[PDB]
């Protein structure tokens, strides 16, 4: 009974207000205060100094209540403005503050007034930021691998970690006051003549400062809700505000009672975590499961609320998550097209009750979905947990919201995740509780460390280019791991010798990436403790230490490998026309590539490369499994390493692979020279594990075939897959059953990680590229998340216009 | 064959030049550079940043060669000037820089020019110094115990640690280059994907920077030795300088060959360790044992050198140790009268060879002693290792140098130390290798952490005052550990109930002292790694971490308990006239003490206290063993604690007691109100474990009897004992045998820790108080060390005139 076409004047009023905020400003309050507190409390341990900085900023910053919201709590002085966090870096800010209103798709209105506040702070943080200090440690060799871009890790060096969901049931069952009580018994057991206890109490001291200021904050919003009602003349909203301060008074301290309370609270947390740290992908976890016992109480039974005012609340909320904005560098902005935050909300899945698995779909799962389908907004990121025994009813209701052309909902697959989690050591009832984090990755909400994916980026295409030409990276002229065999010298005797070169080179860029990651993570852990986040994850409080120090019950991280499709395609093409057939010569190719297929003779060569050799995504086994092998070397490397939290507390403490590379395929391509699959220099790579655009000619069931052949179980950082259909292709009920049997076959027979759809027509993308001004709420799906189309650059825009359009 | 009366014009020229440096200046170079490097390398790990600071300062500072020295290497731009080290503190410097040329016995000429350099640096170090940060951590309660002075620890909060001897045999066997080789193999085994190895390599990186700059420095003194010989016209010294650059060239790199080389090298180290850190009591250890194989080669056999030019070299050296100066606060200066450095040189003892103990006295032991006896200088601090089988010849030669009236040599006692070391876990052949450190304490040179004594000060007299009056400290009006029983309320039922109050109060000031020490030591270990010192102690290089982190093979520390005599005397007096006899009333006493024995009635009361009750030091068992018990509570407390290095590497990791309190008895007295032993308010306490001045009336054999009854074995921080005789009392050979049988009986029958003599007449102390100007090389012994008498304040001067003068 899905009524997906009807908003309300209240929420239509807001959503538009926001989508027209087309060049956001830069609220600078937090970088003002945090410098003060770092200047006033230089003598404190960093966990306490940071707890003060936050408690200061929290009660000296502008707060307001616009748009007649049903949910309240702003990230910044000005609407949709992006705070400034100087602890992680200043370097890209001391290069780029003039050049910021005109930045191809990451433009920030930087007021002459708030620019004054920036020249003032900045030069003091120089030398003492995470990024500055990473460079204080890096070995010289590490420093070159970074300059080139072969291994990239800007995102960890210029931002907090985040990439997790905190323990929202805890927060709800105890309320803040019950966490002070948790903290109090814990510092009751501290002994100050025991080294480890001496450090443990600084971190516990810090937690209490933060917990405190947060209660105070919730009350200084109960404050406004009444000081506003004073000078307010429209009765109907005063009766709302009075209930909100009435509802905020009760959530600043005790466990919440209603639905309106248990969802304002969880937002309050979800916010402060993004004011204390700029890490993106603060997820929500299984919200349809932990807000449900209030939805049931309130509106299903006692019916003191109406199932339609529940759906209106969430909306206000969804729009507050849209309010959350964040500014990134010029370089990293390219790989994060459309300033996203990836705040993920998870619905569905199973639920291990007393040892037996049980369908977890419930009436709030339908209410949450149906509220997303009506709103058509980038936020939240809606991720649905499929399982073999999901209803036909709910899956059809998922296909209904897909035909709404904003990319949601996306799918994750209990059929693959749960058995692999159990298989790593995760507690069986925790493996059933996994959520989506950020984009397509998966963790156990409330019990996992940071970055279940999101660690360092490796460029598979550039590395393979080096395995072909004597270890030489053509982009930068460097040779980091020398070797004799190169194409230009045509002295590979057989293809297996090319595959060896690959196994040899990647084994050395993986070591480096881990050495680099070891520095970053160690700098992040000495300088920037996330106080509140750590309070709200198990088992920090009991171990009295931050997540980065080993506070989390579980801890697994993944990197991101970019260039998947191009690696398969390249190897398979030099395998066929160079070795197998002799059609093309080693030097003839080497000269081809060092030339960017230039001339007319070299162009014929490229086209024989593109179409005279099997491409990944046509259910062709020869290329598909060649790719799985090439990747398998990388997965085999990660096994002889342990991440920095190994042995210091958590379970697991290891790595795995991951393809959730956001829009890094574009700027990563610009750094990759011509490649043997026929790709020209600088053009884009392929995003995620999707097929390279325009090479998949045997339709969608052949695509999922190819994708499902990758070693999914070792790639628990997510296997990203984009598909695009035309709106007329998915139109009748006969077309809907086609999508459904396609999904059910992906997840059950093939064991797929994820799939997300773009239901857009190719002319609509093209009128919005042209007339932005009548398309400023059009949502298209990028890769792991949704974006406002008019907001992406044109590089970003056309990668999305180039993708294959499939029939069902 | 001791010729103790003959210097040389060369060395007489120098010694006088120095003793007239009567208000020293403040060379500010090092605080200039170190701020630069902390400002240029803010991004480095602290171990590397500090290694740079040192390598910078080391090759940008004024260096010279005055006085026609046979040993070269200056601590500072100006002669006898005191560098400035801002890392440990600035606070006492931002209060006291105007008020510094007139400071009762710690006056520093602070040039208007070098005062300019101080206002410039200082305000940047604010908030980031050891002291500033300790206060960033201390619990509020900890902070009050500190304000009062009941527990004091200024010396650890405003200075490096030191209080050790580094591994001088190593340095000599390998030379610097062989330590680069040591360091190189060590970083060869580093793995940069292993957390502990990632930190290990920063510390190893740092060590190499320092090692390097030190070789460079030794060569930039080989530089001067020739650039001077150029513009030099007195042939005879050019032939010396040429050999010194000739000898410095060989010691900047390789293991030294001669005696002149092996003793210039060890000085070079002994110096740089006092430019990198301001910790005092950089000792030398068993120099008569590790320089001897060169003395033997050179002059005993091959005779290429003359036993009289060896004795002239050491002299130059002794005078370079006198050149070493250090500036301290206004408060801490009082407890360190006569700006000393306590650089200790140890001679004699035994020597466990292949499992059998053997006399270690040798011909360099006689040469070192005889060179001290001729020179009559505060530096070095000469400590002799007695054992039951020491010769009559060498002991008489020790008594000869005593009749020289400069306090040296002092005595330590293999008969007590070795069996207690073995008994703690120390390797048997290391227990035979123990040296003296600083004053009277004992450690295993090259294998021990910092502060075998020198940790936190406790005031036994003030604490006992609190056990008498309801936990009330009368000095400051505070009550830190409340209790009902007080004298003013006369409600002790029996004396055992007073002893309980004592056991209860001290058990609580000991906990606090350890909590305080835990903060200081942790701040010292996060902010101020001693690079070179750590390189030269086992087993830092192998564990790749500093001493403070657990680098040292062995690690035991002691505090200092001040007020020993007064505690015994007080308890024994309230035991006799209050309880036992009823002669005096509880309130009558309480009112007595709260009054500073004022009136004429209260004065009779005091005199019955002084002389109507047994005092410690008359071989009286009742008071002697009452004191040992009172102290025994404190020793029993230390057993349930472990110092911060417990479990992190070293052996032992524990505490023990100690009485080596330097001149803290005076300023500590000023903070202690009238006490039941008859002492008036503010007057001095008793220094060390000596008898309270003027209460020991049955002569020296009765004194050593009393002292020997203390629990010596648990007091391995040293039991300090001062004795003073008149020069005519120790004059004939019949008088010498009296001193010798007194010593041999102390150490063998009583098992004494230490004894040192003042052979001065009471009129000589009084003419030098009056006519300073004809007495500026008079040395008198303070407590653990020697001082120039005209340099001590008058408070200091008269504590020394008040001591008992004994007959033999
Ligand atoms: O380097 P960054 O921006 O921190 O990592 C980017 C990550 O953002 C979080 C997403 O869940 C993941 O798909 C993506 O890889
Ligand atoms: O607090 P400070 O000055 O570091 O300690 C003073 C110490 O100096 C080192 C001496 O060996 C010891 O006798 C004395 O107690």
mmCIF file of N, CA, C and O in Angstrom, chain B residues 104-132:
data_model
loop_
_atom_site.group_PDB
_atom_site.id
_atom_site.type_symbol
_atom_site.label_atom_id
_atom_site.label_comp_id
_atom_site.label_asym_id
_atom_site.label_seq_id
_atom_site.Cartn_x
_atom_site.Cartn_y
_atom_site.Cartn_z
ATOM 1 N N UNK B 104 70.554 34.496 48.617
ATOM 2 C CA UNK B 104 71.463 34.037 49.682
ATOM 3 C C UNK B 104 72.181 32.723 49.381
ATOM 4 O O UNK B 104 71.772 31.669 49.883
ATOM 5 N N UNK B 105 73.244 32.767 48.576
ATOM 6 C CA UNK B 105 74.050 31.587 48.307
ATOM 7 C C UNK B 105 73.694 30.802 47.061
ATOM 8 O O UNK B 105 74.052 29.622 46.969
ATOM 9 N N UNK B 106 72.982 31.406 46.113
ATOM 10 C CA UNK B 106 72.747 30.855 44.775
ATOM 11 C C UNK B 106 72.545 32.041 43.834
ATOM 12 O O UNK B 106 71.487 32.238 43.225
ATOM 13 N N UNK B 107 73.588 32.860 43.737
ATOM 14 C CA UNK B 107 73.539 34.092 42.981
ATOM 15 C C UNK B 107 74.199 33.916 41.632
ATOM 16 O O UNK B 107 75.300 33.369 41.526
ATOM 17 N N UNK B 108 73.516 34.395 40.598
ATOM 18 C CA UNK B 108 73.973 34.255 39.228
ATOM 19 C C UNK B 108 73.948 35.630 38.577
ATOM 20 O O UNK B 108 72.887 36.264 38.498
ATOM 21 N N UNK B 109 75.124 36.098 38.147
ATOM 22 C CA UNK B 109 75.229 37.290 37.311
ATOM 23 C C UNK B 109 74.507 37.056 35.982
ATOM 24 O O UNK B 109 74.943 36.221 35.180
ATOM 25 N N UNK B 110 73.412 37.783 35.747
ATOM 26 C CA UNK B 110 72.474 37.518 34.646
ATOM 27 C C UNK B 110 72.517 38.728 33.720
ATOM 28 O O UNK B 110 71.784 39.702 33.912
ATOM 29 N N UNK B 111 73.362 38.673 32.690
ATOM 30 C CA UNK B 111 73.692 39.885 31.946
ATOM 31 C C UNK B 111 72.464 40.456 31.240
ATOM 32 O O UNK B 111 71.653 39.722 30.675
ATOM 33 N N UNK B 112 72.325 41.784 31.293
ATOM 34 C CA UNK B 112 71.257 42.470 30.573
ATOM 35 C C UNK B 112 71.118 41.956 29.150
ATOM 36 O O UNK B 112 70.011 41.941 28.593
ATOM 37 N N UNK B 113 72.229 41.529 28.550
ATOM 38 C CA UNK B 113 72.208 41.001 27.193
ATOM 39 C C UNK B 113 71.557 39.618 27.131
ATOM 40 O O UNK B 113 70.665 39.380 26.308
ATOM 41 N N UNK B 114 71.995 38.693 28.000
ATOM 42 C CA UNK B 114 71.436 37.347 28.049
ATOM 43 C C UNK B 114 70.075 37.314 28.725
ATOM 44 O O UNK B 114 69.365 36.318 28.599
ATOM 45 N N UNK B 115 69.710 38.360 29.469
ATOM 46 C CA UNK B 115 68.334 38.498 29.942
ATOM 47 C C UNK B 115 67.383 38.823 28.795
ATOM 48 O O UNK B 115 66.209 38.435 28.836
ATOM 49 N N UNK B 116 67.865 39.539 27.772
ATOM 50 C CA UNK B 116 67.044 39.793 26.590
ATOM 51 C C UNK B 116 66.644 38.480 25.909
ATOM 52 O O UNK B 116 65.479 38.299 25.515
ATOM 53 N N UNK B 117 67.595 37.540 25.800
ATOM 54 C CA UNK B 117 67.358 36.242 25.167
ATOM 55 C C UNK B 117 66.333 35.411 25.925
ATOM 56 O O UNK B 117 65.767 34.468 25.359
ATOM 57 N N UNK B 118 66.099 35.715 27.206
ATOM 58 C CA UNK B 118 65.200 34.929 28.046
ATOM 59 C C UNK B 118 63.748 35.358 27.900
ATOM 60 O O UNK B 118 62.871 34.508 27.736
ATOM 61 N N UNK B 119 63.467 36.663 27.975
ATOM 62 C CA UNK B 119 62.105 37.122 27.717
ATOM 63 C C UNK B 119 61.615 36.680 26.345
ATOM 64 O O UNK B 119 60.406 36.517 26.155
ATOM 65 N N UNK B 120 62.538 36.469 25.398
ATOM 66 C CA UNK B 120 62.197 36.087 24.032
ATOM 67 C C UNK B 120 61.698 34.646 23.947
ATOM 68 O O UNK B 120 60.615 34.381 23.410
ATOM 69 N N UNK B 121 62.480 33.701 24.458
ATOM 70 C CA UNK B 121 62.133 32.285 24.405
ATOM 71 C C UNK B 121 60.916 31.984 25.279
ATOM 72 O O UNK B 121 59.830 31.660 24.779
ATOM 73 N N UNK B 122 61.093 32.119 26.583
ATOM 74 C CA UNK B 122 60.223 31.629 27.643
ATOM 75 C C UNK B 122 58.740 31.455 27.319
ATOM 76 O O UNK B 122 58.195 30.358 27.527
ATOM 77 N N UNK B 123 58.030 32.488 26.857
ATOM 78 C CA UNK B 123 56.559 32.393 26.828
ATOM 79 C C UNK B 123 56.041 31.326 25.879
ATOM 80 O O UNK B 123 54.830 31.038 25.896
ATOM 81 N N UNK B 124 56.919 30.733 25.061
ATOM 82 C CA UNK B 124 56.540 29.698 24.112
ATOM 83 C C UNK B 124 56.527 28.335 24.760
ATOM 84 O O UNK B 124 55.672 27.506 24.446
ATOM 85 N N UNK B 125 57.472 28.101 25.663
ATOM 86 C CA UNK B 125 57.524 26.859 26.417
ATOM 87 C C UNK B 125 56.403 26.753 27.436
ATOM 88 O O UNK B 125 56.086 25.636 27.874
ATOM 89 N N UNK B 126 55.804 27.883 27.825
ATOM 90 C CA UNK B 126 54.690 27.842 28.761
ATOM 91 C C UNK B 126 53.649 26.846 28.273
ATOM 92 O O UNK B 126 53.327 26.801 27.083
ATOM 93 N N UNK B 127 53.140 26.024 29.194
ATOM 94 C CA UNK B 127 52.142 25.030 28.873
ATOM 95 C C UNK B 127 52.670 23.696 28.369
ATOM 96 O O UNK B 127 51.932 22.705 28.422
ATOM 97 N N UNK B 128 53.914 23.630 27.875
ATOM 98 C CA UNK B 128 54.448 22.393 27.306
ATOM 99 C C UNK B 128 55.714 21.914 27.998
ATOM 100 O O UNK B 128 56.474 21.150 27.399
ATOM 101 N N UNK B 129 55.982 22.357 29.224
ATOM 102 C CA UNK B 129 57.101 21.844 30.005
ATOM 103 C C UNK B 129 56.647 20.748 30.973
ATOM 104 O O UNK B 129 55.481 20.689 31.385
ATOM 105 N N UNK B 130 57.596 19.865 31.312
ATOM 106 C CA UNK B 130 57.418 18.796 32.293
ATOM 107 C C UNK B 130 56.645 19.316 33.500
ATOM 108 O O UNK B 130 55.594 18.775 33.857
ATOM 109 N N UNK B 131 57.155 20.375 34.130
ATOM 110 C CA UNK B 131 56.484 20.935 35.299
ATOM 111 C C UNK B 131 55.063 21.399 34.949
ATOM 112 O O UNK B 131 54.090 21.022 35.621
ATOM 113 N N UNK B 132 54.921 22.194 33.880
ATOM 114 C CA UNK B 132 53.600 22.689 33.494
ATOM 115 C C UNK B 132 52.622 21.538 33.308
ATOM 116 O O UNK B 132 51.428 21.660 33.626
#
